[PDB]
Amino acid sequence: ARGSHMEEMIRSLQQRPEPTPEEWDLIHIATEAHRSTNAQGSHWKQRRKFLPDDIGQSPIVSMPDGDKVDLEAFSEFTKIITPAITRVVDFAKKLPMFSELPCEDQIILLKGCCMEIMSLRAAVRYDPESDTLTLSGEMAVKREQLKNGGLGVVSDAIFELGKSLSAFNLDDTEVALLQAVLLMSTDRSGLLCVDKIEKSQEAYLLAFEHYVNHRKHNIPHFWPKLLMKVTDLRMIGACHASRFLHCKVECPTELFPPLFLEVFEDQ
Ligand SMILES: N[C@@H](Cc1cc(I)c(Oc2ccc(O)c(I)c2)c(I)c1)C(=O)O
């Protein structure tokens, strides 16, 4: 019927496929890679400081879509963006299927997912009571502030994602696997090792579907619902890439930290 008598008893309430031992090892590695690079781990809610409320209310630099930029808010956010980008690279480097790619492939994949991953890490720290996001576990920001400091409607999409993810009760492994599925994408141009990257994505997706089955979440249809959030995050990444091109047409390079320009000054 099954396996041994013990195995069937332990699996008695399981229906759905659980992770294999090899998937559990993949899951453990990705979870630890995320927790060792996710800032302020559990400490974030006490240790975050609100962005002063008089910053972000003065958008005066024009943009093509008519959502203007407040340069002082954009400066406060870019001031802390280089350590946050650096943690996404630290995370990817800790995944063996990423670190074994050619160096050129690893840079293309990191450029392709960086905003998706930093937006997910802000959105999972949405706080319903203050209606804020937390940036790098330290800066609490209101919708108006993040919208006027350069993101424009991107910030609304991240807040909407953050508010919707509260009911999903994601744990650190789910966040780490959504990050690995975002990272291991072949939807980018100029990759060499396409088949290998697709195979990794498929291994991460299936470990992730089996870990979701293991967790027995209390909202129904959890796995497709979570896939639809991955799609929302890729839309957020595309919106940000379009918006960042416009930033650079409008504003001088001196305002953009070198690593921020490198990861996104892109297509
Ligand atoms: N909160 C994340 C890091 C994180 C840091 C920052 I600054 C963010 O804001 C952005 C992002 C792109 C931009 O062009 C602008 I202007 C502001 C976001 I959204 C996320 C972490 O915990 O790693």
DSSP letters spanning 111-129: HHHHHHHHHHHHHTT-BTT
Count how many Cα atoms sit within 13 Å of the Cα of residue 182 in the half-sphere of its side chain: 34
Helix count and strand count (H, E) for the chain: 13, 3
CB count, 10 Å around CB of 195?
10
CA of 77, closest atom in ligand 1: 7
Structure tokens at 257: 């930290």
User: What distance in Å separates the CA atoms of residue 248 and residue 78, rounded to the nearest whole number?
Assistant: 13
Which 3 state secondary structure label does DSSP give 36?
coil
Please give the residue range of the domain that contains residue 12: 1-267
Instruction: Determine the distance from the C-alpha atom of residue 21 to the mean position of all C-alpha atoms in its chain, rounded to a whole number.
Output: 26
Of 207, 195, 225, the closest CA to residue 18 belongs to 207
Other Cβ atoms less than 10 A from the Cβ of 197: the count is 22
| CB of 136 closer than 6 angstroms to any ligand 1 atom | yes
Q: How far is CA 12 from CA 16, 218, 228, 244, in A?
A: 11, 19, 30, 52
Q: Return d(Cα 138, Cα 190) in angstroms, integer.
A: 36
The ligand 1 atom nearest the CA atom of 78: 7
Experimental method: X-ray
Domains held by the chain: number: 1
Tell me which DSSP letter residue 13 carries: S
Of 115, 216, 214, 233, the residue nearest 165 (C-alpha): 233
C-alpha 44/C-alpha 172 separation (Å) is 14
> What is the resolution in angstroms?
1.9
Q: How far apart are CA 263 and CA 159, in angstroms?
A: 23
Index of the ligand 1 atom closest to the CA of residue 135: 1
**Token representation of residue 211:** 């870990």
Residue in the block written with tokens 């949405």: 126
| CB-facing half-sphere around the CA of 232: CA atoms within 13 A | 20
Sign of CA dihedral 197, 30, 222, 132: negative
Q: What percent of the chain is helix, strand and coil (3-state, nearest 5)?
A: 65, 5, 30
Distance separating alpha carbons of residues 50 and 254, to the nearest angstrom: 26
Distance CA 138, CA 127 (A): 13
Q: What is the CATH number of the domain that holds 2?
A: 1.10.565.10
CA distance 168 to 147: 25
Question: Residue 29 has which token pair?
Answer: 């590695």
What DSSP character marks residue 41?
T
Distance 209 CA to ligand 1 centre (A): 28
* CA-244 nearest atom, ligand 1: 14
Q: Is 80 in the pocket of ligand 1 (CB under 6 A)?
A: yes
Question: To test ligand 1's pocket by mutation, which of 35, 61, 79, 119 has the most ligand atoms within 8 angstroms of CB?
Answer: 119
Q: How far apart are the first and last CA of the chain?
A: 55
